[PDB]
């Protein structure tokens, strides 16, 4: 009841016009600020209590950020395009020791988004569905968050079926990337925790704050 795909697309278009791992971390810290402004632009997000806004962003920042640069890298050959305006080629990631996860991002995400020509509007929604995760621990009123999530995927199914009539199974195909994203998101965090432990790899204040407890 008041979750138009138009406002969602606007949040998306408004936020985005030497050790590959270090460059990746610098970019993630950078994107963390933008993600806050993005969320604020998502209908009804700001009306939730500040504590739930914090929970939702702390719970999904990683998947949210992985979906973005994946879709951003759709035109790239074998690598992702970082927000810092830097490209990380498959081989670069391989010789830095993170080839496995990088390959999972190329195969399970970038490639699939490309094969189905996922559009910016569809992305925005998938990210909005991820933001509104009713399963986040701590939520003061999870049912409310579940309501928002339902309005989002209702508008998405509406956008689909109407924009891609020839494709009756497009709605599901889009939601079915969510298990992959969650999986790749958990693996990426593990790496982030290891890098922190190791002591190498500079980690900026906002990215560091995300690795705090809980």
């Amino acid at each position: 009841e008041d979750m138009p795909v138009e406002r969602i697309l606007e949040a998306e278009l408004a936020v985005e016009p030497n050790d590959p791992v270090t460059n990746i971390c610098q970019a993630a810290d950078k994107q963390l600020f933008t993600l806050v402004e993005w969320a604020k632009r998502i209908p009804h997000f700001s009306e939730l209590p500040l504590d739930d806004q914090v929970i939702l962003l702390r719970a999904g920042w990683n998947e949210l950020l992985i979906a973005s640069f994946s879709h951003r890298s759709i035109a790239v050959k074998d690598g992702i395009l970082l927000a810092t305006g830097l490209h990380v080629h498959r081989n670069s990631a391989h010789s830095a020791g993170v080839g496995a996860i990088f390959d999972r991002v190329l195969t399970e995400l970038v490639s699939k988004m490309r094969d189905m020509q996922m559009d910016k509007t569809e992305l925005g929604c998938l990210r909005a569905i991820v933001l509104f995760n009713p399963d986040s621990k701590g939520l003061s009123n999870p049912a409310e968050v579940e309501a928002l999530r339902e309005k989002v995927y209702a508008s998405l199914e509406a956008y689909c079926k109407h924009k891609y009539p020839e494709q009756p199974g497009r709605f599901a195909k889009l939601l079915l990337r969510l298990p992959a994203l969650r999986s790749i998101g958990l693996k990426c965090l593990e790496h982030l925790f290891f890098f922190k432990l190791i002591g190498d790899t500079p980690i900026d204040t906002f990215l560091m704050e995300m690795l705090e407890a809980p």
Binding site: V36, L50, V54, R58, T205, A213
Partner: peptide, 11 residues
């Protein structure tokens, strides 16, 4: 806890 995040959200 979560200093930065809170500040960015209130603004």
């Amino acid at each position: 806890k979560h200093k930065i995040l809170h500040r960015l959200l209130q603004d």
